[PDB]
Design a protein around this ligand. Structure first.
Ligand code: LLL
Ligand code: LLL
Ligand code: K
Ligand code: K
Ligand code: K
Ligand code: K
Ligand code: K
Ligand code: K
Ligand code: MG
Ligand code: MG
Ligand code: MG
Ligand code: MG
Ligand code: MG
Ligand code: MG
Ligand code: MG
Ligand code: MG
Ligand code: MG
Ligand code: MG
Ligand code: MG
Ligand code: MG
Ligand code: MG
Ligand code: MG
Lengths: 111, 88, 47, 66, 102
RNA sequence: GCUUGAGUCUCGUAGAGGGGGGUAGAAUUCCAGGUGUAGCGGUGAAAUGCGUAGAGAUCUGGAGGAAUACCGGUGGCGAAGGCGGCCCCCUGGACGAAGACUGACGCUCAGGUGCGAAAGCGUGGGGAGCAAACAGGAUUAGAUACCCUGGUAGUCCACGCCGUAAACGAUGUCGACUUGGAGGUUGUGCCGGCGUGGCUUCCGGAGCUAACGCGUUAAGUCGACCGCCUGGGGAGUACGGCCGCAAGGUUAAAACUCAAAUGAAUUGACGGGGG
């Protein structure tokens, strides 16, 4: 299968899919008992990875290609947790979308 | 810009010889040919302001050379403007 | 950045400059602001 | 360091010469800066144009993910 | 004027390219142009997918010709559904030497 | 008359210079399907918002607009404004090398004319993303804000108008002259060097300057012509003229009022500046 890690600044979503991108299971830092400051940490992403690895216990997946997307805390800790759960991490690939210019981004925050 | 072959014909037509490239008559005839050629460009490309600045320099330079030639020798001036179809 | 293997993944992402690119593209930078930082950094390395 | 194009005395880089051009792209397919490769400015501009033409003809990739 | 012309043909018309090359150069020669170089690179692997395809058949042509008949050739490339992509480029000079591919 | 200023010709060179047309790849959004299941999104923390009518995530296909990562650079080009994927067509300027040619044809320029960022205006298109206004959620004593979720003009295109910006080098144009040092970029000559041009960045000498600084790209030493200033405020306002569809632009006072206003630098003190 393929592990898709959506690592945003606020949250991490881990979706395990087959090799044709059909979803098998998923978990998130926000739905693993972390809100606010706690949701956007490497640990919350580690916990999300484990619970997602738990969510696809029935399919009996051995090998995982890993697809990392976005700038967030749970880039690495999610991948380690899949290795800790005992997947054959065959590939690590960054698929973070980069425009080749693209659209005007939102205005800067004056905080 | 004007081609080598079109330039060389003008130089021959209005010059003393093939190498009289500096004559006021030759210079004016060359500017006139390029000014006339570019009318087609600017008819199509009305907002080509940058290129038009180059055209207006050709117009101004021609005016200055014709003015020089007039007082230097009006007979040469009078023939030149007649041959090229210039009001002045 | 296609790929001890995890350290190799970190390094490939440093070299493509993935996170620097994403951080720079979070918010719009006016051309005046971009020129200003380009000058300030040009001056910096030149010291 | 040092510009190979001045060393060989090449007139142009040539978009067809993929062997050469592949030395001036990263693994991501990105054009490598002149400060890293030591290419001269004039040749870096010719190189960038060659790589862009090659990318258009699908002789090089734009990215590692197509 | 001197032009370098690359075109890519859909890989299920590799057999139509000998015709294409003959017909396109008849246009050049008939309008009193030179063919300076003509190379058929054959089917190559694309660096990225073009319209689902992973391969295409490349032809290179260096040509001296009037502007007018090269304009005719690009419109031929436009509507010919076999021709998936093409580049026409001005060169300063005629090129006759073998390309780095061949 | 002359050829040294200024031009012309020949051959090349670099360039995001301009106008027009075409095309590529990345990404965002939307639409249609597949898989899948309870969250997603957002913040300092939240909430509004979105989601079991199946979101978010992931995959496939499609639509559409706008912008062109890397290259990229005190890099380049342009009178300034400005100009950045790739390809073609039309086109302007600059520079160099050899000679030849014209023979002061030059410089500057009130009035005049043209060009002129962004916003804005008119008509017709277009509209992904962004986003004045606006709406809701927060924050707060209040919060017509900053922050969050949305979002219309607009931003895009064609044609016309507007004519302004800290439109700045806050430095008018042209020419001559006057120690150096270190870079960049772009020609070219002779044998990795040694020459000869153009453009450009930084430091600094004399000199200049209130000082700060400028310093062969002068703010030095001179010449030509133009524009402009004459205490602060009232005021770039009023009235009149001209221009503009409008918004407004432009030209431009007076009464009254104050004894200052101002520049640079110095010592402190202070900072929700740094060490
Ligand atoms: C306004 N029209 C322009 C049109 O003028 C042209 O732009 C050229 C641009 O192609 C050139 O640049 C491009 O092509 C070069 C070779 N010709 C190589 C470098 C490349 N960036 C610039 N040097 C000058 C622009 N005016 O092509 C693009 C365009 C937008 O259509
Ligand atoms: C004032 N500093 C200069 C800097 O401006 C620049 O100077 C070059 C000089 O190197 C070039 O000349 C030199 O390099 C040439 C490279 N093709 C060959 C001939 C050689 N004399 C000149 N043609 C132009 C100057 N602007 O490079 C050298 C330098 C000393 O750093
Ligand atoms: K076609
Ligand atoms: K005058
Ligand atoms: K809108
Ligand atoms: K002092
Ligand atoms: K008025
Ligand atoms: K007064
Ligand atoms: Mg040009
Ligand atoms: Mg506008
Ligand atoms: Mg409008
Ligand atoms: Mg918004
Ligand atoms: Mg907002
Ligand atoms: Mg003003
Ligand atoms: Mg400006
Ligand atoms: Mg400025
Ligand atoms: Mg001013
Ligand atoms: Mg003037
Ligand atoms: Mg310049
Ligand atoms: Mg100095
Ligand atoms: Mg002074
Ligand atoms: Mg007024």
């Amino acid at each position: 299968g393929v592990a898709h890690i959506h690592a945003s600044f606020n949250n991490t979503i881990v979706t395990i899919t087959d090799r044709q991108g059909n979803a098998l299971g998923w978990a998130t830092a926000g739905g693993s008992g972390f809100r606010g400051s706690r949701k956007s940490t490497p640990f919350a992403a580690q916990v999300a990875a484990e619970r997602c690895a738990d969510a696809v216990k029935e399919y009996g997946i051995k090998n995982l290609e890993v697809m990392v997307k976005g700038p967030g805390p749970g880039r690495e800790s999610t991948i380690r947790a899949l290795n800790a759960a005992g997947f054959r991490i065959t590939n690590i690939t960054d698929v973070t979308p980069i425009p080749h210019x693209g659209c005007r981004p939102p205005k800067k925050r004056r905080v | 810009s004007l081609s080598t072959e079109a330039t060389a014909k003008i130089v021959s037509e209005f010059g003393r010889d093939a190498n009289d490239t500096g004559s006021t008559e030759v210079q004016v005839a060359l500017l006139t040919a390029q000014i006339n050629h570019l009318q087609g460009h600017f008819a199509e490309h009305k907002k080509d302001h940058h290129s038009r600045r180059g055209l207006l320099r050709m117009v101004s330079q021609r005016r200055k050379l014709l003015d020089y030639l007039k007082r230097k020798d009006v007979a040469r001036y009078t023939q030149l403007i007649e041959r090229l179809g210039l009001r002045r | 950045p296609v790929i001890v293997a995890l350290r190799r993944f970190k390094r490939s992402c440093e070299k493509a400059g993935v996170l620097a690119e994403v951080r720079r593209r979070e918010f719009y930078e006016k051309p005046t602001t971009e020129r200003k930082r380009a000058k300030a950094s040009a001056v910096k390395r030149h010291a | 360091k040092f510009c190979r194009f001045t060393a060989e005395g090449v007139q142009e880089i040539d978009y067809k010469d993929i062997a050469t051009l592949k030395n001036y792209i990263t693994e991501s397919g990105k054009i490598v800066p002149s400060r890293i490769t030591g290419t001269r400015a004039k040749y870096q501009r010719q190189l960038a144009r060659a790589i862009k033409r090659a990318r258009y003809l699908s002789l090089l990739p734009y990215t590692d993910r197509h | 004027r001197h032009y370098e012309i690359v075109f890519m043909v859909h890989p299920d018309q590799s057999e139509q390219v000998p015709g294409m090359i003959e017909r396109y150069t008849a246009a050049i020669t008939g309008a009193e142009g030179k063919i300076h170089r003509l190379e058929d690179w054959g089917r190559r692997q694309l660096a990225y997918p073009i319209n689902k395809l992973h391969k295409a058949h490349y032809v290179l042509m260096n040509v001296e010709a009037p502007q007018e008949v090269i304009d005719e050739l690009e419109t031929t490339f436009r509507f010919n559904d076999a021709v998936i992509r093409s580049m026409v480029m001005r060169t300063k000079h005629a090129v006759t030497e073998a390309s780095p591919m061949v």
